[PDB]
């Protein structure tokens, strides 16, 4: 489906994760069917030029339901910083959803131009001997494009992530537990029921990433070794390199959504310490 | 189009470096051959290079002793000879990989080719004898021990060659022996002076020597 | 290693008629996609050309006579009908493993009617007997087959060990062969010896060939 990504506060950005999965995959299969033979090589400028050229094509494309994001933010901000809203939110969610919807032989489009140009790539990638297929762009593209990837997240302990966010996630939930007792009124009490719900469902979505993510970077180094100081023939080849790309397509994918779902998670909780600035403020005086 | 360079005679145990120089083509997008055709014209296999030089294949016949190289920059291919054998004695051409796309190609263009002869033997001058009939007409030039091969024979300058018989060379102790015959009308030759031309290039020989009774 | 066997070694075949040449592999150069063999042509004094891409991937400048087929271990080069314009070395190749092997070779040969040699004996020149050497040269210039036999005789004794043979790969023209035949002997050897005489008995004839002299 889709996923939505509040970053910063006044930012909202979409993606649609079969979309850029999709794309993911074409992209790899470009530098694979390029860093093959030493000849190729030269044309990764033209490549990179046509990502570009696609990937700025696609945020044209989103950027077309800017009002109706830019409404959205609107209504994001008054719920921030204070039933009536609560069902004026689901309405405009509704409603961005519909947009993307709208756009939908709009983005396969660019989504099939891209797939039209990694295949045909691929279709003319040639081996020499085709008995012996070499595996030089498999480990080139890997040690230049993937590795640093699977470094960045075998450094960052995303389990310790999840770890403090349950006992953040806890308090608040600890917190709402007493204070529906005989207090609920004016601390913004909704605000609270808003953002812990809106908090809750963000958690989801980073463990949903995160358990891909640790996923496959057990897979993708387990699976290059079999593929790298080697020979294989053009119909295994062939096939190894789509193995690969797909593995690799999901892991980006489902990484890029889990750093973007990490800064939106806090920007939810900056949210909460400033409405929280209230609580202190209004529990202070009750002692005098 | 594809030309080899570095040829001669080498006595056995020495080294030697060939080279040929490729045109016609963008160089560094084809895998680059050397094969070897002995005297009794046999093909013989000698080192594959791929475009970008990282893949290197070589018989176990030439293997370490041969070095196969290119300057994609320079647009040339190289191979090396080191403690050459006998054996190594042939005509050496260098040659382009088709470049197929489903599939591994053939040696589609060839170049032609440089001889190597890896023998302790001296390079000597020939000695030229006009072969005169016995006190139509058929006349001889005989060439005795020279080396290394080849020997141009032309009769007068090249002039009077039609009905002309060179024969291959033969190595009878480690110098050659070829034999030429012109034939020509009984009235043609006593009057028309027809001499026989050879030349010797390792040797730098140019000699004419006349046939007469 | 794979090895190529290619038969026949030699080949005569009359004008217009047809020329059959089979390539036998060791292991399997095929897979259910692609044929990784190929014919190249060899014309005298010129290196190979290529004829045949992979199994009949004809060139680009090779006639509608030509045509190479098969598959796996077993191929066969077929030319029909034949002209002057073939006659050179046919080589098999294989592209399928490390070792790339050639085959033996197919020397193609015009079929023409037999002809007579043209027999000629010289004495050895005087330059080359002042230096101390005595070639007896006895030249045969057309003739068809490449068979022929030639005895040398002095004073009517055969001779058979100071000769030095060499033949003429077939004339283009007149597609005839021709072969010198030399009989060294020193100074003094050849000084001892009266009749020197060359027999050529070849098929065109009953009896042999005779050139001869006396010094």
């Not at chain 2, 190289?78 to 470049?99: H, I, P, V, W």
Request: contains cysteine; glycine residues 6%.
């Amino acid at each position: 489906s889709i996923d939505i990504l509040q970053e910063k506060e006044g930012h909202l950005d979409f993606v649609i994760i079969p979309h850029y999965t999709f794309l993911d995959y074409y992209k790899h299969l470009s530098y694979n069917s390029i860093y093959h033979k030493s000849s190729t090589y030269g044309k990764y400028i033209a490549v990179d030029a046509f990502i570009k050229k696609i990937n700025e094509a696609y945020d044209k494309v989103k950027s077309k339901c800017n009002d109706i994001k830019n409404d959205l933010i609107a209504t994001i901000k008054k719920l921030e910083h204070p039933k009536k809203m609560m069902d004026e939110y689901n309405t405009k969610k509704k409603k961005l959803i519909k947009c993307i919807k709208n756009h939908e032989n709009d983005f396969n489009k660019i989504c099939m131009d891209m797939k039209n140009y990694g295949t045909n790539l691929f279709e003319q990638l040639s081996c020499y001997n085709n008995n012996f297929c070499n595996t030089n762009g498999i480990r080139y593209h890997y040690d230049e494009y993937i590795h640093k990837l699977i470094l960045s997240v075998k450094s960052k302990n995303l389990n310790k992530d999840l770890s403090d966010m349950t006992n953040i996630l806890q308090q608040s939930e600890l917190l709402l537990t007493n204070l529906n007792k005989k207090m609920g009124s004016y601390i913004y009490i909704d605000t609270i029921k808003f953002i812990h719900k809106e908090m809750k469902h963000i958690f989801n979505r980073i463990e949903y990433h995160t358990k891909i993510i640790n996923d496959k970077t057990k897979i993708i180094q387990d699976k290059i070794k079999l593929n790298i100081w080697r020979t294989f023939q053009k119909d295994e080849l062939l096939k190894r390199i789509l193995d690969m790309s797909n593995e690799y397509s999901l892991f980006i994918t489902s990484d890029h959504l889990r750093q973007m779902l990490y800064n939106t998670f806090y920007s939810k909780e900056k949210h909460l310490n400033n409405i929280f600035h209230h609580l202190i403020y209004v529990l202070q005086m009750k002692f005098n | 189009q594809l030309v080899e360079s570095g040829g001669g005679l080498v006595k056995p145990g020495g080294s030697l470096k060939l080279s040929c120089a490729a045109s016609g083509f963008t160089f560094s997008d084809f895998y680059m051959y050397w094969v070897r055709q002995t005297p009794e014209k046999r093909l013989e296999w000698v080192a594959t290079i791929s475009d970008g030089d990282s893949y290197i294949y070589y018989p176990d016949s030439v293997r370490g002793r041969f070095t196969i190289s290119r300057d994609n920059a320079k647009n040339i291919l190289f191979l090396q000879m080191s403690s050459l054998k006998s054996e190594d004695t042939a005509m050496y051409f260098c040659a382009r990989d088709g470049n197929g796309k489903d599939g591994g190609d053939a040696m589609d263009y060839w170049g032609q080719g440089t001889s190597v002869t890896v023998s302790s033997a001296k390079t000597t001058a020939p000695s030229v004898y006009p072969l005169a009939p016995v006190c139509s007409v058929t006349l001889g030039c005989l060439v005795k021990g020279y080396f290394p091969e080849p020997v141009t024979l032309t009769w007068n300058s090249g002039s009077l060659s039609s009905g002309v018989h060179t024969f291959p060379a033969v190595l009878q102790s480690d110098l050659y022996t070829l034999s030429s015959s012109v034939t020509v009308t009984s009235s043609t030759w006593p009057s028309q002076s027809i001499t026989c031309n050879v030349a010797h290039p390792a040797s730098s020989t140019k000699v004419d020597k006349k046939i007469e009774p | 290693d794979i090895v190529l066997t290619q038969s026949p070694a030699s080949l005569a075949v009359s004008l217009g008629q047809r020329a059959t040449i089979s390539c036998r592999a060791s292991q399997s150069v095929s897979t259910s996609s692609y044929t990784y063999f190929h014919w190249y042509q060899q014309k005298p004094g010129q290196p190979p050309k290529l004829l045949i891409r992979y199994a009949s991937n004809l060139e680009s400048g090779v006639p509608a006579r030509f045509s190479g087929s098969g598959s796996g271990t077993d191929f066969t080069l077929n030319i029909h009908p034949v002209e002057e314009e073939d006659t050179a070395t046919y080589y098999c190749q294989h592209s399928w493993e490390i070792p790339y092997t050639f085959g033996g070779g197919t020397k193609l040969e015009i079929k023409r009617a037999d002809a007579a040699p043209t027999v000629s004996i010289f004495p050895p020149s005087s330059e080359q007997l002042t230096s101390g050497g005595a070639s007896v040269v006895c030249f045969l210039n057309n003739f068809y087959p490449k068979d022929i036999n030639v005895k040398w005789k002095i004073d009517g004794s055969e001779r058979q060990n100071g000769v030095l043979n060499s033949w003429t790969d077939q004339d283009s023209k007149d597609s005839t062969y021709s072969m010198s035949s030399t009989l060294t002997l020193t100074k003094d050897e050849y000084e001892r010896h009266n009749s020197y005489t060359c027999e050529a008995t070849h098929k065109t004839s009953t009896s042999p060939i005779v050139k001869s002299f006396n010094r």
